[PDB]
RNA sequence: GCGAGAAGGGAAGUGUGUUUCAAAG
RNA sequence: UUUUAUGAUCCCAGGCUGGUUUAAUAAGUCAAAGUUUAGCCAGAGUCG
RNA sequence: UUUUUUUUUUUUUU
RNA sequence: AGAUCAUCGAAUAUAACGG
């Protein structure tokens, strides 16, 4: 059964309607364009269900309660969860997307798509964002954080390093690229 | 402004072709949230807000239209007004070069991009010959 | 003369045809 | 020149006083007994504008056909109620408008409503 | 027979024709030319974009009563659709639909 | 031909068909295939149509 | 309905172009001229029938628009029609009057 | 890979690539010229193959020998009237971008008038010169 | 001289495409060459009538019947075509 | 008070003959004290689809009603062709009429101020405003809603074929921060459409937005000629080389661009143009740009792209214009899918 | 981001349909 | 003032069309008042 | 006017 | 946008507007 609608953080409490969609008794086929994403092998809307309503028994209340956001998985941590805790927000830092432990690419319905090379039979070139100016509205899991966005080159080390690049000056200081997941850099 | 909004003259020439929406298509704007609303989009508001807008000015009577008989008019021939000025003999030339086997080598002596796969660089360069014929066709049609 | 192109020889066929009905 | 303000607290009385909905018949009779309009003019002189602003299918004047006959209706006089569009308080500010200006460019050297002309 | 519950024929969107005028500059045929937009209009997108939209209430027909008979243990009938801006109302929702 | 192994110009003609060996027409009709779809328009230009072709257009001279 | 063979016999062609006129036309006789400007012109028309092969004759009365009322009681005249509605009965214009009757 | 692609197959030789242009070169280009339409289609899509060149080059060599010499010698007046039209819109594409236009200069187009803008004595009273740039001669 | 194909394009259905039809018996189907707009049916209303193809003949070799003097007349006008 | 007509949708046959157009006039009226008229004339030496009569001394025609005013129309109307537009000009709309020949004349003149670099994003237009429009008239806009003293001699005009004032007007600003302002206020805006009888007219509702810009300089007319679907790009970073540092990064973006090429003219901001094959690549680029905007906070009215086109341009000795072509079959290269 | 009633007989009689013409958002 | 046997007021039911060959000095040049099987047009709205 | 903002802008007086 | 027979159920007819 799919998991009961639940609101936000930082939102009021809401009206709960009686059915999904108007072609609720008439129609079966039909889907909504704002349907939960919930079934494994998907990712959240960010900002509609990603951080629903936490509640706990008077026992379990604790101020290890209010960390889970610092402490979530590499695979969930987001920018704005991994900045709050670096020294200076993170700020004078670099951060690049590392797009190889994706949930769809690892299990989901659609795990097994054709591309178009077919399957993978076997130093890049990755992005770096540096984070300027910081503005915080609901921590620790939203900000309004402008930096330099440029290309860079990674090393030969086993980890993922960047040596001396970044070298090009691609756009001024504009908005985050994503905010699904990011690495640590050298600062 | 009640029965059509403020609605720019550049946006409505060019949505001609443009196939209206379905049934299940028009319940998703519908639907809350909407999202999908623009500036000056509400259907709500813009039915009434535009008039409000010109009551404190004057009104434009409507213009006296007085009832006049159309007088008959017979069916006249008339050439065609868009008939290319090319030469026959230029157009049999070119037949030959698109048809002939010099097409077939041409795809393949094309610079590579980045990015793209051996088939694409050959249909984009057979697409860009495709377009040729069809202007010599049109061209032929008209003059006979 | 020596028509080598298909779309030629076809239309070679429509004209002798046509020739044959007029009277 | 100089044309005079029509206040809208003067077009209640007349409005209220020929008496939500009112025919037409007694406004037309009503308009002339207050002088707003100042020749003297006729009634008739009323009735042709009437028609020729093309003021009933604009309203939705014919719309009332339908509720007593219905699908005979539909269908035109040869292939009926003929009563008069019963004007509200919003519509007939705009035809007292209308009609204000329409007497008023009959004699002026600049016409407003319509100054072209085809050959 | 005097204030009978008639009925009407039912009648969906009309598509506009490919071929179709803005304004017909002194028209020299005996009718009307169609339109391209017909009953559809063009708004301004979330997104800075022009696409279409369901207009308002399209001439919603309550002369017909519903066909489904369980339509009221899903949704409310008899609803309205009001007009609203500041301290501002207009009366349109009577929608009539007059002869050709 | 043999060698090349190309077509040859002349060669043998149609095989136009008749029913019943009659092939004369004394009173032919106005037939409207002269213009596949297309029409003139009131400003005499000529205009295409959109309507659906008839199986028996040419069974019924 | 007419079926396709139909549409080619003489009977129905000669029946068609007598309905037809320039301006999809019309001619018709006065038969109320009491409201103002306003005159009810009676057309009369024809149809063929494939059973019997026999014409018949219907009236058809239409209402029509005057500008100058030039036209009277049963004088002939000339509609022609037009792709509005004005008025609640007035669907026609007025051209020309070919006859007019003394007074 | 990508960059496999790129490497493996892809080698076209051309002939006359990378070649300056000869006596013999010029007058071939202005034969070809009357053979194909210029103003006609694309013009330099069979030249380039008997040239066995670029497409580009090619246009380059024609626009410096005919284009410019004629175009110096011509009055060119700059008007908006064809040019401003929208893009038909698509599935992927519904909405309505900016444009740019290209409005020749004198250095390649000798835009001058035939005739000095004249005024008759009764019209010129209703002129503002406040309003104006270009003072009014005569 | 684009306001010669106006009436061809469709708001509703789409621009005109060229296609094939499936039709006859069962077992002995055949290809029906023909012009119609995009989201027409596959069997359904078409504008004309090009020809036909017969991949399966008694003689072993795929006959082609075609229309030389309609094809490029509806090219010209901007009518697309499958691979 | 009345002071003269105005017609338009002329033949060209009547226009190029003084004779034939003064014997008009003289049997309908006054002959050509007697009444004069002006002729509107191009740059390159050719005549209008209009024209304009002026009467004599107010002093012989201050008395003049509706009712002699009607049987002169009417009178004045018959002699002209057929097709032809005979409307009366009062006095406040007699005096806008002479600026109108006068900027379709000055039309190439005017459109060389700002046009290069030097004014890039300044430039704005709003196609609101119908043919009566003037200098004058127009510069009390944006000055009582928006606080915005503009240049008076820098306001530009369209026309269309007919000569006619094009309801596309494009304005200028001195600076470039009140550039925004301007096109954040002016939405749905009705300040009066026309002043006669000492009242308003209709309303009209206004709408600013910035979708077009200007550009001359010597290395755009050639190298814009040779692709047939060619963009521009502009509001980059610091100073950067095409091959090797503009094709580098492109990677990382989805451009999806052919060739490039650059834009000198030693400013702090670059521009680098783009080359497709389709139609639908391109269309396709447009939307993923637009897309990208957004996300990156950067502005809706800001200008960040655009599509590259040519002017449509006049040149002598031709019978007849390329604009005015109707044998052209330049419309096939935008395939239609649905 | 795009497509989706592709499983609809509930309404209507002078209507639904057919025919003749027209349509440069 | 308006319709009205050329059917005005008025009660129940039925949605319109195409489909190639088709014998006989009814030898149909379109199957001759009305007979169908892939098909065209067309078929309201609602989360308060 | 009150919560929500990955659709904006404005703030001076010799 | 114009024109475009009605039929069955046996049948039963003059109705609506203003003084």
Request: proline fraction near 8%; charge should be positive.
């Amino acid at each position: 059964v799919p998991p009961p609608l639940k609101s936000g953080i930082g939102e009021p409490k809401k009206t709960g309607y009686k059915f999904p969609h108007v072609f609720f008794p008439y129609k079966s086929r039909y889907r909504s364009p704002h349907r939960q994403r919930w079934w494994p092998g998907s990712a959240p809307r960010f900002l509609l269900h990603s951080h629903p309503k936490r509640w706990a028994p008077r026992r379990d209340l604790s101020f290890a309660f209010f960390a889970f956001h610092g402490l979530k998985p590499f695979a969930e941590k987001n920018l704005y969860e991994l900045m709050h805790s670096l020294p200076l927000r993170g700020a004078s830092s670099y951060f690049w997307r590392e797009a190889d432990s994706d949930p769809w690419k690892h299990l989901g319905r659609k795990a097994n798509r054709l591309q178009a090379r077919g399957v993978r039979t076997q130093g890049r070139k990755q992005l770096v964002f540096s984070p300027r100016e910081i503005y915080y509205k609901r921590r620790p899991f939203h900000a309004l954080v402008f930096g330099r966005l440029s290309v860079g080159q990674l090393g030969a080390s086993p980890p993922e390093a960047v040596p001396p690049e970044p070298e090009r000056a691609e756009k001024p200081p504009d908005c985050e690229s994503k905010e699904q997941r990011k690495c640590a850099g050298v600062s | 402004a009640l029965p059509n909004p403020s609605v720019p003259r550049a946006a409505l020439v060019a949505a001609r072709f443009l196939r209206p929406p379905g049934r299940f298509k028009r319940a998703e704007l519908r639907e809350h949230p909407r999202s999908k609303t623009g500036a000056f989009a509400n259907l709500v508001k813009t039915a009434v807000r535009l008039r409000e807008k010109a009551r404190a000015f004057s009104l434009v009577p409507p213009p006296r239209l007085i009832p006049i008989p159309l007088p008959a008019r017979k069916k006249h021939l008339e050439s065609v007004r868009g008939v290319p000025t090319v030469s026959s003999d230029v157009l049999a030339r070119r037949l030959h070069f698109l048809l002939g086997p010099a097409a077939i080598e041409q795809q393949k002596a094309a610079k590579m991009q980045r990015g793209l796969t051996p088939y694409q660089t050959e249909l984009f360069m057979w697409e860009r010959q495709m377009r040729e014929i069809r202007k010599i066709y049109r061209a032929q049609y008209l003059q006979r | 003369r020596k028509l080598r192109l298909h779309q030629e020889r076809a239309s070679r066929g429509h004209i002798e045809y046509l020739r044959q009905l007029e009277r | 020149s100089s044309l005079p303000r029509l206040l809208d607290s003067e077009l209640t009385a007349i409005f209220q006083g020929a008496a939500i909905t009112v025919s037409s018949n007694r406004l037309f009779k009503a308009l002339l007994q207050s002088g707003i309009l100042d020749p003297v003019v006729e009634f008739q002189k009323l009735c042709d504008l009437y028609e020729e602003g093309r003021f009933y299918r604009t309203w939705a004047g014919g719309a009332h056909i339908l509720k007593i006959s219905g699908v005979k209706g539909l269908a035109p006089p040869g292939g009926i109620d003929g009563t008069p569009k019963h004007m509200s308080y919003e519509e007939f500010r705009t035809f007292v408008h209308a009609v204000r200006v329409w007497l008023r460019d009959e004699r002026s050297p600049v016409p407003l409503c319509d100054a072209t002309v085809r050959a | 027979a005097f204030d009978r519950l008639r009925r009407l024929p039912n009648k969906a969107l009309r598509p506009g024709k490919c071929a179709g005028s803005l304004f017909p500059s002194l028209p020299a045929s005996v009718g009307d030319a169609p339109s391209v937009h017909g009953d559809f209009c063009v708004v301004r997108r979330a997104d800075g974009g022009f696409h279409l939209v369901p207009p308002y209430p399209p001439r919603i027909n309550r002369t017909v009563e519903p066909y489904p008979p369980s339509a009221g243990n899903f949704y409310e009938l008899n609803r309205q659709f009001k007009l609203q801006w500041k301290n501002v109302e207009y009366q349109f929702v009577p929608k009539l639909l007059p002869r050709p | 031909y043999r060698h090349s192994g190309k077509p040859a110009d002349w060669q043998l003609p149609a095989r136009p068909f008749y029913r019943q060996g009659v092939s004369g027409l004394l009173f032919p009709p106005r037939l409207r295939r002269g213009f596949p779809s297309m029409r003139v328009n009131s400003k005499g230009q000529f205009v295409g149509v959109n309507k659906m072709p008839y199986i028996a257009e040419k069974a019924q001279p | 309905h007419y079926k396709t063979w139909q549409r080619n016999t003489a009977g129905y062609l000669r029946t068609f172009m007598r309905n037809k006129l320039p301006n999809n036309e019309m001619i018709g006789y006065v038969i109320n001229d009491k409201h103002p400007k306003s005159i009810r012109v009676a057309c009369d028309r024809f149809m063929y029938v494939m059973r019997y092969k026999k014409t018949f004759r219907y009236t058809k009365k239409v209402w029509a628009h005057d500008e100058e009322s030039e036209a009277r009681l049963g004088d002939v005249v000339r509609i022609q029609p037009l792709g509005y509605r004005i008025g609640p009965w007035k669907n026609y214009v007025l051209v020309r009057v070919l006859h007019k009757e003394p007074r | 890979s990508y960059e496999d692609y790129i490497d493996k197959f892809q080698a076209p030789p051309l002939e006359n690539e990378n070649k300056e242009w000869t006596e013999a070169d010029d007058a071939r280009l202005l034969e070809l010229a009357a053979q194909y339409d210029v103003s006609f289609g694309d013009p330099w899509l069979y030249i380039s193959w008997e040239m066995q060149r670029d497409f580009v080059d090619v246009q380059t060599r024609y626009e410096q020998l005919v284009t410019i010499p004629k175009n110096k010698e011509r009055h060119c007046e700059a008007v908006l009237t064809k040019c401003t039209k929208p893009l038909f819109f698509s599935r992927y594409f519904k909405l309505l971008p900016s444009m740019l236009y290209v409005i020749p200069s004198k250095a390649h187009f000798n835009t001058a008038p035939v005739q000095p803008f004249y005024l008759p004595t009764p019209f010129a009273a209703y002129r503002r010169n406040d309003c104006f740039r270009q003072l009014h001669s005569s | 001289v684009r306001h010669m194909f106006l009436p061809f394009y469709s708001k509703e259905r789409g621009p005109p495409r060229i296609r094939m039809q499936v039709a006859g018996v069962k077992g002995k189907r055949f290809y029906k060459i023909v012009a119609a707009n995009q989201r027409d049916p596959r069997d359904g209303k078409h504008m004309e009538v090009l020809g036909s193809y017969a991949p399966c003949t008694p003689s072993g070799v795929e006959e082609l019947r075609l229309r030389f003097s309609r094809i490029k007349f509806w090219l010209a006008a901007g009518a697309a075509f499958n691979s | 008070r009345l002071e003269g007509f105005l017609l338009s949708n002329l033949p060209p046959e009547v226009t190029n003959n003084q004779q034939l157009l003064s014997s008009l006039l003289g049997r309908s009226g006054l002959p050509v004290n007697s009444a004069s008229i002006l002729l509107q004339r191009s740059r390159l030496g050719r005549t209008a689809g209009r024209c304009l009569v002026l009467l004599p001394f107010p002093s012989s025609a201050f008395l003049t009603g509706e009712d002699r005013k009607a049987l002169q129309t009417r009178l004045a109307a018959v002699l002209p062709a057929g097709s032809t537009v005979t409307a009366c000009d009062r006095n406040d709309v007699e005096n806008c009429i002479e600026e109108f020949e006068r900027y379709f004349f000055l039309t190439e003149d005017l459109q060389r101020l700002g046009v290069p670099s030097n004014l890039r994003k300044v430039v704005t237009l709003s196609p609101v405003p119908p043919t009566y429009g003037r200098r004058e008239v127009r510069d009390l806009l944006r000055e009582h809603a928006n606080v915005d003293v503009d240049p008076r001699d820098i306001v530009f005009r369209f026309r269309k074929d007919g000569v006619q004032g094009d309801t596309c007007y494009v304005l200028c600003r001195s600076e470039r921060d009140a550039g925004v302002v301007l096109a954040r206020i002016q939405e749905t805006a009705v300040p009066n459409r026309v002043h006669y009888g000492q009242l308003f007219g209709c309303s009209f509702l206004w709408a600013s937005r910035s979708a077009l810009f200007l550009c001359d300089s010597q290395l755009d007319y050639l190298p814009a000629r040779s692709p047939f679907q060619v963009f521009t790009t502009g509001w980059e970073g610091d100073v950067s080389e095409e091959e090797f540092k503009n094709l580098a990064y492109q990677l990382r973006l989805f451009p999806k661009a052919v060739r490039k090429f650059s834009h000198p003219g030693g400013e702090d901001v670059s521009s680098f143009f783009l080359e497709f094959h389709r139609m639908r690549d391109a269309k396709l680029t447009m939307s993923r740009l637009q897309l990208l905007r957004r996300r990156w906070r950067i502005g809706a009215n800001t200008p960040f792209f655009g599509f590259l086109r040519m002017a449509d341009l006049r040149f002598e000795d031709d019978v007849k214009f390329a604009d005015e072509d109707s044998a052209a079959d330049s419309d096939l290269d935008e395939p239609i899918d649905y």
